[PDB]
């Protein structure tokens, strides 16, 4: 839970995996997507009008 900062240099060897972790995040979010019940669907609620 730390905001990234360009003042921090990090470790280059570990931070090469940054975009790999990013595309892992994208793939995982893709996996995590699922249809929602209309009884609680705020997307349907905001798509009322």
């Amino acid at each position: 839970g730390e905001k990234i900062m360009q003042n921090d240099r990090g470790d280059v060897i570990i931070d090469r995996y940054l975009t790999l972790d990013q595309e892992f995040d994208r793939k995982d979010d893709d996996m995590l997507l699922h249809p929602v019940k209309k009884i609680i669907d705020l997307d349907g609620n905001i798509q009322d009008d």
């Binding site: 280059v12 940054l18 975009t19 595309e23």
Partner: protein, 247 residues
Amino acid sequence: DRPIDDIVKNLLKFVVRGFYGGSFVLVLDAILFHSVLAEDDLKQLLSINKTELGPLIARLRSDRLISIHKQREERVYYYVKYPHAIDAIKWKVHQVVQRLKDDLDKNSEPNGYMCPICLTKYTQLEAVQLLNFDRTEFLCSLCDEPLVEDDSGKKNKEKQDKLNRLMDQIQPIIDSLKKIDDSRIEENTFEIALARLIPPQNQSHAAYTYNPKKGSTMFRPGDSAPEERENEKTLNDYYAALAKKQA
């Protein structure tokens, strides 16, 4: 990543394939297929020279397509500045569109005249002020030559058709521009291309890393973002029982 970036890359491929040389096609395809590259790595990959490289790189700088990066490790790298590139493309297509539209508008006008002795064109109004006393034809002021009409009236439909078919050819670029305007663009940097480094070689001389400087304020343009088998088992247990006995 985002498919709109992929559309941008394929747009660049289509644009160069339709408007530039094969060498430009190869260079831009290679540097998109890879990332920021050193010059000697390009010479290794394409087996080329600085003599051949010069005009192509110069033209790519002229169209503001690929920003050139230099750093000391001096090692020279190259990356496509996306917003400056698309703004240059938009400006060029806008200029082409306005140019050809005004060409068609001007070609819809009366063609005019010329005096072929002095090889000087004459407008319709210049013909009007240069008429004879007979109110029939027009005589030149210097060569005193009867004015002969310009030949562009049949060219009006030809330029219209060239405009139409050129718009048809350029239409995928227009659609990609529309999708780009739908999208929101993040500006390319050298270190951004470093984050998407695509190494061609395992023997490249260049250290494709960014090494920043402290105590420096150097500002420059182009950088701006404001059973049997059971037995052996039981014999295995026989060995283990004997092994635990001595222990």
